[PDB]
Amino acid sequence: EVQLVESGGGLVQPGGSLRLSCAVSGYSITSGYSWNWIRQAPGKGLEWVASITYDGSTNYNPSVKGRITISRDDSKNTFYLQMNSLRAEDTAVYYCARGSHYFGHWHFAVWGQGTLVTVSSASTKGPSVFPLAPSSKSTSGGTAALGCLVKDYFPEPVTVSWNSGALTSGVHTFPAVLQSSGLYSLSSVVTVPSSSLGTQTYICNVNHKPSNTKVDKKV
Amino acid sequence: DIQLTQSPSSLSASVGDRVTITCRASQSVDYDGDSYMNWYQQKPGKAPKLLIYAASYLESGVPSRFSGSGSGTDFTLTISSLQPEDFATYYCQQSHEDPYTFGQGTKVEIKRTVAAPSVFIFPPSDEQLKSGTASVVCLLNNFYPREAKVQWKVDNALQSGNSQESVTEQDSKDSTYSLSSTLTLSKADYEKHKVYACEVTHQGLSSPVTKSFNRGEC
């Protein structure tokens, strides 16, 4: 019943500033012992950066010493992360998380979904979506593959579902690859019964928030 | 200040097998008899999930197959019997001193029986061709192990430096992987050739498998 939902992710100019927010639901921020931000560079690895205690005490990882401000708004049931003088090193998925009243406090049982922050001089570019049409050459056994090619976008990430999330079984959405152009390209496929290709409609729903691009492609 | 080192960095194991992962701190995380080491599980595209707190306590709602032990500077996460849904990166985290720190993560894969790829190939769309480029896509579906070789051939010329591939994480459904290779060419180059082939070599195939098509049926 307690969810952490985050906003403020996206493209940021090197030297610029970011402002993340974690909106708490099903729980009062004031009841929390601790609220936190933890980031993870795409490469991998988790890093705690900041915390605010229920009394308002703030704490920061020296790794980002003096360019961070954790704060909260009790009437909004929300807390915030602000950083400035952003470097490429600051590109990471940023997670909010709740600490505990028990057992040393500083372990996190509740997290938000995370938001990606990309620090780059490049500009946003929405993707093109092309069909990956079923064929006899995509029908090996009594089962056919079709998909969508989400090509030439920046920055990450892109969201891909099928039939408005109604079709999950057999769906593979691949990790984006970075092209020599500096743009990202990604494919999503779904294996389905070849006997339903004539009677069932298949729509991949593509979302790229950074460019405000949404596409629904029938294949 | 305070450095945690896990081992191994990566491991692969048969379903049901016991799995143990080590965490070593640079200083003690002991305090009032309690040990402030924690363990997280992170599945792809997900926030870390807390498994163990205070070295040995099972977090509510986590399966009993996961357990923690240790104290001072030596800590152990164990999974009694590895389940398919257990593929993930596992982290240890000390909560004794600020700058709260994590281990580098241990990657855990389920080792299943060999399963050969199902290969599919997709021609460029006319929609894309009008844009001046042609992407050809090859799909290798549900295979194990992860390693696979994909060769692109255009009228039997081996293409190199011309394509990119991506591999899904392990699917818990059946412990396989999938892989997408995309061959990119100019429309001009695409229109000038006929035979587009995707050749695949995998441990599960006695010999390579080639899926192809001829432009004019694309």
Residue numbers in the entry:
A (entry chain H): 1 to 219
B (entry chain L): 1 to 218
Passage from the reporting paper:
Here, we have solved the crystal structure of the omalizumab-Fab and docked it to the free IgE-Fc X-ray structure using our SVM classifier to obtain a complex structure consistent with known experimental data (see Results). The 2.42-Å crystal structure of the omalizumab-Fab region shows a highly negatively charged surface (which shows the surface electrostatic potentials from the APBS program for the six CDRs). Surprisingly, the three histidines in the H3 loop (His97, His100a, and His100c), which were assumed to be positively charged in previous works, are predicted to be neutral by five programs (Reduce27, Whatif28, PDB2PR29, PROPKA3, and HAAD31). The neutral state of H3:His100c is consistent with its low solvent-accessible surface area (SASA) of 3% in the crystal structure. Although H3:His100a (SASA = 15%) and H3:His97 (SASA = 31%) are partially solvent exposed, they are hydrogen-bonded to each other and well-packed with vdW contacts to nearby hydrophobic residues including H3:His100c. The predicted IgE-Fc/omalizumab-Fab structure is consistent with the following experimental data:The docked IgE-Fc/omalizumab-Fab structure shows that L3:Glu93, whose mutation along with L3:Asp94 to Ala reduced binding to IgE26, forms a salt bridge with Arg457 in the Cε3 domain. The L1:Asp30 side-chain points towards the protein interior in the X-ray structure and is hydrogen-bonded to L1:Ser31, while its backbone is in vdW contact with L1:Tyr27D and L1:Asp28, which binds IgE via hydrogen bonds with Ser471 and Arg470, respectively. Thus, L1:Asp30 plays a role in stabilizing the L1 loop for binding omalizumab, hence, its mutation to Ala would destabilize the L1 loop, accounting for the observed loss of binding to IgE26.
Omalizumab has been approved for treating not only patients with severe, persistent allergic asthma, but also patients with recalcitrant, antihistamine-resistant chronic idiopathic urticaria. Furthermore, omalizumab forms small immune complexes with IgE11, whose fragment antigen-binding (Fab) regions remain free to bind allergens; thus these immune complexes serve as “antigen-sweepers12”.
